[PDB]
């Protein structure tokens, strides 16, 4: 099923999460090809992951560096596991903050329990050129994922 | 996924190249909406696009001439010949430096003291007049123009 090209962290046909550089949001993707490119500083060869997005074939094949690819998110935190300072993957909608949106990394800043509900607030990390959003109320506190590493 | 508006060349969410009306060069874009506008005769299609890397410019209305399938194929040197209309990287303000992607009519090519050189007429569409006898500095990155 999975084919090891012999380098890089992901197999051909492996299902992964891929980050869109403009948005900062993570999307379900699949490795289609893995290539190498010279480092700029004479260091180790840099790995390029060629991915396709599972629900967005219109995007074609996109070439990404390691920072923008990781194993597919699969584990959700229990409430007691959430603590300020953790970097976690959350759902958030920057345009309509009360609604479902995209999947972003966030630094948890604060959690509390009110008389009505459990609340989590976090610093949302956006795109490479995009600033962070502070004190974002994460509306889906039972859908906060652990970020996987290779 | 793509969505068919029922007319025109491009689907909703389709990724394309689209001209900057405020510059004349071509930019990665995506179809947002497709509509028709009254002409007096045949209704004309309006493609509403957003530019991938310029969200701040929002959605812009373009006619078909200012939208085309995204560039994907580079020419080999041996393929370049005077008269061809191709897409090149050029900077009108600092002509030796990288700029943006303009259509160009190839006028001359030659090898000078081992350096491949290409000269051509830079086209701006209707964003401005053409720029004649421009040296194209990036001769290994000259692209085929796609059609619908």
């Amino acid at each position: 099923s999975l084919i090891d090209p012999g380098f890089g962290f992901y197999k051909i046909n492996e299902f992964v999460d891929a980050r869109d550089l403009n948005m900062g949001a993570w999307f379900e993707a699949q490795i289609v090809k893995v290539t190498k490119t010279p480092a700029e500083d004479g260091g180790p060869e840099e790995i390029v992951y060629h991915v396709k997005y599972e629900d967005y074939p219109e995007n074609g094949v996109v070439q990404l560096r390691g920072k923008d690819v990781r194993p597919r998110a699969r584990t959700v935190y229990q409430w007691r596991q959430l603590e300020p300072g953790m970097i976690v993957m959350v759902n958030y909608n920057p345009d309509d903050p009360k609604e479902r949106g995209y999947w972003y990394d966030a630094e948890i800043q604060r959690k509390r329990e009110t008389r009505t509900q459990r609340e989590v607030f976090g610093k949302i990390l956006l795109g490479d050129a995009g600033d962070s959003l502070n004190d974002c109320r994460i509306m889906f506190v039972t859908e906060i994922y652990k970020i996987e590493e290779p | 996924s793509l969505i068919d508006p029922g007319f025109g060349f491009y689907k909703i969410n389709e990724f394309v190249d689209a001209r900057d009306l405020n510059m004349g060069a071509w930019f990665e874009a995506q179809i947002v909406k497709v509509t028709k506008t009254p002409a007096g005769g045949p209704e004309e299609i309006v493609y509403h696009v957003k530019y991938e890397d310029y969200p701040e410019n929002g959605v812009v209305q373009l006619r078909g001439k200012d939208v085309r399938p995204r560039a994907r194929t580079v020419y080999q040197w041996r393929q370049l010949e005077p008269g061809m209309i191709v897409m090149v990287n050029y900077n009108p303000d600092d002509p030796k430096e990288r700029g943006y992607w303009y259509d160009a009519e190839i006028q001359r090519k030659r090898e000078t003291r081992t350096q491949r050189e290409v000269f051509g007429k830079i086209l701006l569409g209707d964003a401005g007049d053409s720029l004649n006898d421009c040296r194209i500095m990036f001769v290994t990155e000259i692209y085929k123009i796609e059609e619908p």
């Binding site: 550089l21 995209y102 | 992607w101």
Partner: peptide
């Protein structure tokens, strides 16, 4: 499968970029 809203990623492949 994650529940999502909104559209897809903003960038598509572009060989020149």
């Amino acid at each position: 499968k994650r529940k999502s809203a909104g559209g897809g990623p903003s960038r598509a492949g572009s060989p020149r970029r």
